[PDB]
Structure 1
């Protein structure tokens, strides 16, 4: 159980204890998706309004 990379300073100290050794899409690609769901939305609203017109 050996203690390594001991650093000390006035605020504290830090170290390591080793007990045993080892045995993204683009901006266009996102604007595309956002506006495509906006198209699905505007279609659903159109279906609603055509149905209300019937």
Structure 2
């Protein structure tokens, strides 16, 4: 009902129409969890090569 903040130009126009009023981890912390996953992979591969050696 109320048309506010009307702004016009050559390209177009913009406005607001109101009907009713109202009633991060560190660089080291990232590299730590990535290397913790790399070591878990390396342990699983070591357990595999141990099994294959047996």
Q: TM-score, normalising length from structure 1?
A: 0.98
Q: Which runs of 4+ in 1 moved over 2 A?
A: none
| In structure 2, distance between residues paired with 1:33 and 1:12 | 50
Unmatched runs of 5 consecutive residues or more in structure 1: none
RMSD: 0.3
Q: TM-score, normalising length from structure 2?
A: 0.98
1:5-51 CA-partner distances (Å, limit 9, x unpaired):
00000000000000000010000000000000000000000000000
Unmatched runs of 5 consecutive residues or more in structure 2: none
